[PDB]
Amino acid sequence: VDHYNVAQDVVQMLTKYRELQDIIAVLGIDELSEEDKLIVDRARKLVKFLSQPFQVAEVFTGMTGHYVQLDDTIDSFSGLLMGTYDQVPEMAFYMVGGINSVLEKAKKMAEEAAELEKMRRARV
């Protein structure tokens, strides 16, 4: 039941985001409602999250492939839908495996950003 509910919620989010893209591509993101922006952000994270590096495409992707368990996928997508990962950067979901890989990539990105901020601040 949980698998079915999560899949249906993801499909509904993607459908609504596709509908909103028609307006976005003409006017702009800033011409949306307050909640529409939240839907857009969540749907963009979903679209990025759906990507995965295959163990056979390591040459083209240049990254170690991932094998995501069925339960892990359901849990990660259910958590993402609830919005508990709104703070995580959008690119953290790009080309990763489960949620743990997303969090590890987000941690690395945060460390890099902190290093850049420290370098900029020290420049003063």
Partner: peptide, 30 residues
């Protein structure tokens, strides 16, 4: 009061999320 008298995989995700949030807050500070 009576409740007191009477008496891990998900923890890793929570720990990682807390660490990420802490780093993202620290970078904003300085």
């Amino acid at each position: 009061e009576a409740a007191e008298r009477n008496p891990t995989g998900d923890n890793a995700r929570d720990r990682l999320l807390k660490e990420v949030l802490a780093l993202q807050a620290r970078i904003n500070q300085r």
